[PDB]
Write a protein that binds this DNA or RNA. Structure first.
Ligand SMILES: Nc1nc2c(ncn2[C@H]2C[C@H](O)[C@@H](COP(=O)(O)NP(=O)(O)OP(=O)(O)O)O2)c(=O)[nH]1
Ligand SMILES: [Mn+2]
Ligand SMILES: [Mn+2]
Length: 539
DNA sequence: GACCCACCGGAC
DNA sequence: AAACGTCCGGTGGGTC
């Protein structure tokens, strides 16, 4: 490209280099723009940001986030990564997209700007005629990038002193459990090393090996194996407790307080828009979509996510979302009637699992039933189900039979989806988002059947993702006009932050927007709560 | 110091 | 572990 002086003309493609991948923490090392066969390189990147009207190019959202961090309203526009991701969601990184559609991802701003230009032209042309993918781009993914940039730059408040105190308490309990393990083993070793633990459990203590690991064939020490051995030796129960506490301390309690940003005083995740095979978002650096919630200690961690003073958190979460989606996609009359009658299949599975009235189901029980319902739906074996429910093999196989007998149109939909996936090579969501699954025709059965479970999961999970994304796009301008913030997305859940005096109005409105995002053959119901902390808002 | 591999486990 | 799916991250073990 011919070099031309900064600034670039309006509408040019942007290229940029960060000192590190996280835009909230990155130094902007270089900034360039390309257009009309010309490349423009900025003498001072920070100053030159003020010249741009929007971020148009590869990884546009990251540049927009850094602009917001600097107090600049620079919205993200076109991003050929989003085009590539709609054509094939295995298009997840710039390195791969470049090597597929006509360029090379380097470390220089100007080359990245020129690459963004050539890649947009090529990919936009590949979408000519793909009307449904173009609708998803214009109506969901491109506007969604702007919502996500604002969420990333806003962040979430964390009770740091709380988590600091909690680390010290959890350490004390870890030390006691460790001493108990070493004593029950008769000697110390590195309880964090699964190799050392394997030798101690299965060679020294002679416990029976339940299963083996995939690539190296070691005797597994997974929670499931230990669950199976929970009564075969008292040490197992203690190892299960040690694993729980060390997992939560090392992954959440200790690292999260060290990620507070100095200028915002808040914690900033990244919402990756081209990272999953189904159209879900992902979250990283840190992942705020897998914050603990299940166990009592997990709940204490979740309580550390709090509202700014004078604000409240609002948490909203679709009810039984993939089951409602399945009802719509399959057309099963029986499953539809379940939701038109206000029934709860997680509660009903819970009542059967634990043999208690629906009134007696607690959150820990409902979660367990949740895993059963989706485990069975997406192809869990009677063998594993027998082990999860702790019932005879026969009684687990009888549950899988009843489950699908209740909704006969579902297996019919599974087979039509797989058959169409074999013919077309891809499966698709309600909105036409595609996932290519060529192993539906694999000649090795185990491989093929794994591909089948991925293939008919995708329309259900991806439709639910499409609906959530569309709701975010519709809800975001309403929130800005009410003075409220969108903070987090957790797949079928939003966490908002609102002025105390407006929290109730925001909760009501967000619930309506979410439930009415796109009418299906069943109603979408959204559970909403308000609190000073993430856990209390979910109650 | 950066990176990889395998496994293990958090959430939805 | 096992014929649930989708992700990301810590640890040990290892290399360069
Ligand atoms: N395959 C699979 N999908 C899962 C699993 N857990 C969650 N999902 C998928 C399927 C779920 O529909 C979706 C959202 O998860 P939630 O909000 O935690 N549960 P839901 O919406 O069903 O029930 P309610 O909100 O009334 O508590 O994530 C699982 O173990 N397996
Ligand atoms: Mn839900
Ligand atoms: Mn949820």
């Amino acid at each position: 490209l011919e070099e031309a002086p900064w600034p670039p003309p309006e509408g040019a493609f942007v290229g940029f280099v960060l000192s590190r991948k996280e835009p909230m923490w990155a130094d902007l090392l270089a900034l360039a723009a390309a257009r009309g066969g010309r490349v423009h390189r900025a003498p001072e990147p920070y100053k030159a940001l003020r010249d741009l009207k929007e971020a148009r190019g590869l990884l546009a959202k990251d540049l927009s986030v850094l602009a917001l961090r600097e107090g600049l309203g620079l919205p993200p526009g076109d991003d050929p990564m989003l085009l590539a991701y709609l054509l094939d969601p295995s298009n997840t990184t710039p390195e791969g997209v470049a090597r597929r559609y006509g360029g090379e991802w380097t470390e220089e701003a100007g080359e990245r700007a020129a690459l963004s230009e050539r890649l947009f032209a090529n990919l936009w042309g590949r979408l000519e005629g793909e009307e449904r993918l173009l609708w998803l781009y214009r109506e969901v993914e491109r506007p969604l990038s702007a919502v996500l940039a604002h969420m990333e730059a806003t962040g979430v408040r964390l009770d740091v002193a709380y988590l600091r105190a909690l680390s010290l308490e959890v350490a004390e309990e870890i030390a006691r459990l460790e001493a108990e393990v070493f004593r029950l083993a008769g000697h110390p070793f590195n309880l964090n090393s699964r190799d050392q633990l394997e030798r101690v459990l299965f060679d020294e203590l002679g416990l029976p090996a339940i299963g083996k690991t995939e690539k190296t064939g070691k005797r597994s020490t997974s929670a499931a194996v230990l669950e199976a051995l929970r009564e075969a030796h008292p040490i197992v129960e203690k190892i299960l407790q040690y694993r729980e506490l060390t997992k939560l301390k090392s992954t959440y309690i200790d690292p999260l307080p060290d990620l507070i940003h100095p200028r915002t005083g808040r914690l900033h995740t990244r919402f990756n828009q081209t990272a999953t095979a189904t159209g879900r978002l992902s979250s990283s650096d840190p992942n705020l979509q897998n914050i603990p919630v299940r166990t009592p200690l997990g709940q204490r961690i979740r309580r550390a996510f709090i509202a700014e003073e004078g604000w409240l958190l609002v948490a909203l979460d679709y009810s039984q979302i993939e089951l409602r989606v399945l009802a719509h996609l399959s057309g099963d009359e029986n499953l539809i009637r379940v939701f038109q009658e206000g029934r709860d299949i997680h509660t009903e599975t819970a009542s059967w699992m634990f043999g208690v009235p629906r009134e007696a189901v607690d959150p820990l029980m409902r979660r367990a039933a949740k895993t059963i319902n989706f485990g069975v739906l997406y192809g869990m074996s009677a063998h594993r189900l027998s082990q999860e429910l702790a019932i005879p093999y026969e009684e687990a196989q009888a549950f899988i039979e009843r489950y699908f007998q209740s909704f006969p149109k579902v297996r019919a939909w599974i087979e039509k989806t797989l058959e169409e996936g074999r013919r077309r090579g891809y499966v698709e969501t309600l909105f036409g988002r595609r996932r290519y699954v060529p192993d539906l025709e694999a000649r090795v059965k185990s491989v093929r059947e794994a591909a089948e479970r991925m293939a008919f999961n995708m329309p259900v999970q991806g439709t639910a993702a499409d609906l959530m994304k569309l709701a975010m796009v519709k809800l975001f301008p309403r929130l800005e006009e009410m003075g409220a913030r969108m903070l987090l997305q957790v797949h079928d859940e939003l966490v908002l932050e609102a002025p105390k005096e407006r929290a109730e109005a925001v909760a009501r409105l967000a619930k309506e927007v979410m439930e009415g995002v796109y009418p299906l053959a069943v109603p979408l119901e959204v559970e909403v709560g308000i609190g000073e902390d993430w856990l209390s808002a979910k109650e």
